[model samples]
Target chain A: GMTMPIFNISDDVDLVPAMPAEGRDGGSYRRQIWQDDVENGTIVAVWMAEPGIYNYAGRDLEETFVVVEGEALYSQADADPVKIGPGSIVSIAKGVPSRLEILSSFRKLATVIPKP
Target chain B: GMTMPIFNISDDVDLVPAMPAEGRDGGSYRRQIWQDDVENGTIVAVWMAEPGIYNYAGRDLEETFVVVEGEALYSQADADPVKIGPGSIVSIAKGVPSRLEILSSFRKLATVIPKP
Candidate 1:
């Protein structure tokens, strides 16, 4: 038997204030599960400030992002920035070290693997 | 301990054609768990036809609808049709017998409780 647990961000959990990244290139709001308890696959959530940029270095995985609010330019290295907004679904496949830059105020839900 | 199962409708499940309700007022597409296995609190998914109407006959629950595709006019008894489209989130609280009419082709995801 499977037990389904339901959660709503507004009703079930508190909205925490996001901290701006000091060394990184953008501001972000994120909530995630702990690294230790998570198994092989995991989902990560990220909310970013306008005009923010993230360098993934070289690590890559299949990722999906659903924009919750505002608009953003999602780009990979050497590629053009693709603007995305609320309800926009973006899928970044494996081996692409993606870079995301906020064009406007943006909030998004991101799902990633490996529990990192 | 809890296990998270991942489902990809595009890669995993077959899309079943929805049969039009013969005597009813609209078309709908639905996917759900079995009635017997569902607990007290559950969610139901409804993908509906354009210009659809449903009569609840007074039984009500807290339900949420997220527009997946297309647009529609969601109206309750004697109320006006509120035009809604993709990315629209609607909350229908208890005790309201609502009617949904499609202004154009409409598709949505609905979560209902009690597995009904």
Candidate 2:
């Protein structure tokens, strides 16, 4: 049987916990998962993190971040930090080393697209 | 070869146009697509529509919508219409009838999840 769908983002729900020592500098973060319907090739959710540079070391997929609240300093590899805020959407290209530092309490929605 | 990733959402790019006469009562709408990567089973993007009710007919997928701009009166069949605003996020289950009226110029971001 299939699991029940989560309708509300702010409501309590069990989400995938962070991987062990996943962050290079030991920063804590949480994903407020909103969707996981892959049959149609889509995933949607929010991410929150403390103030520090956190690496998103994924190789096979690209992700997009739309800042809904708070502020963050984003950096891609050796690239300089860019301040992101409300209505700001950033795309992380595949194979690029990217990190985000939460300058304030950070909350942003992430969309992961399937590779063709 | 993989297609070049679209880094900007507002930049000029071709998006999937609406289905022909797909709307129940001939309402015009456009989807400002930002991502289509499915390898990670995630999709993130925005949708815009003229002021009218449009039925979102689909199955085998669960979607979440966050109102980014304007206002709308959302109704799910027998459920009463609810006003949605900038911070409003609504979820559509795998199988359900959902319709929205663009009380004002409406724009929303949708995320689809993978079925486990």
Candidate 3:
């Protein structure tokens, strides 16, 4: 039987530390909502991080995200930093290096399609 | 160069009447945010509807949606009606027939992957 799974975005979720990276204080965490679709190369999750500077090098995945809370300055190589906050949606292509300077505690919903 | 597009969910969206169906008042509408990915068979959009009973026969697209406002009673074959409200996230597989009894004016964000 087909089932519809419902998730409340504000519900408590297990938070795990993010991978070590430059300028990070290990205060970043992710709550994965869906990732079992590995065969389809899709994943959906939410990420939160305290105010800090975090280096981010893109991986073999195309990602789109909507900021749900707080604000940040998103910087990409050779591009001026873009200020983003709640209600901001961004799509990043695979292998694009970027970084985030958290202006406030930030949370966002992220969707990814990994390269096959 | 890769570009990141941003859309504020609450921004004014063009609304158009939905397809005719049982018990509908022709007040349902959809605003597409991203759909240019036809090559990848993906789409992201928002749907809004006035209070009404609308028949929804599933198609060859897998859809995930989060109820952002109002409430609805989702009726499916051989199953109890599910009460869904704000913050409810639902994933519907392709070809599942269902109906929505809108309890109030409703709005939601929808993501879909069409059959290849």
Per-model root-mean-square deviation over C-alphas: 10.6, 6.1, 4.0
Selected candidate, larger TM-score, 1 vs 2 = 2
Pick by DockQ: 1 or 3, better one: 3
Instruction: State the weakest 10-residue window (summed lDDT) of model 1 chain B.
Output: B1-10
Residue by residue across B1-116, what tens digits does model 1's lDDT show?
Answer: 01111122112133344655345543555543112121453333445464545445335555555565576666654566676666555655556566655666665545443212
How well is each residue in A27-85 modelled by candidate 3, as lDDT tens digits?
67887766534376466677878888888776786777777678998866657788998
Q: Which candidate gets the maximum lDDT versus the true structure?
A: 3
DockQ value of candidate 2:
0.23
TM, chain A, every candidate: 0.64, 0.69, 0.83
User: Which pairs of residues collide in model 3?
Assistant: none
The deviation in Å at residue B81 for candidate 3 is: 4.4
Q: Rank the candidates by lDDT, best first.
A: 3, 2, 1
Name the runs in model 2 displaced over 4 angstroms: A1-28, A31-42, A113-116, B1-43, B58-60, B112-116
Instruction: Write model 3 residue lDDT over B53-90, tens digit each, in one string.
Output: 88777688677776766899886555677888766667
Best of the candidates, TM-score: 3
How does chain B score by TM in each prediction? 0.63, 0.69, 0.83
Q: Write the candidate numbers in order of decreasing TM-score.
A: 3, 2, 1
Candidate 1 residue runs with Cα over 4 Å from true position = A1-116, B1-27, B33-38, B44-46
In candidate 3, residue A95 scores what lDDT? 85
Model 2 agreement with the true structure over A45-106: per-residue lDDT tens digits: 66655565666665565677666567777777677777776656677776777767778766
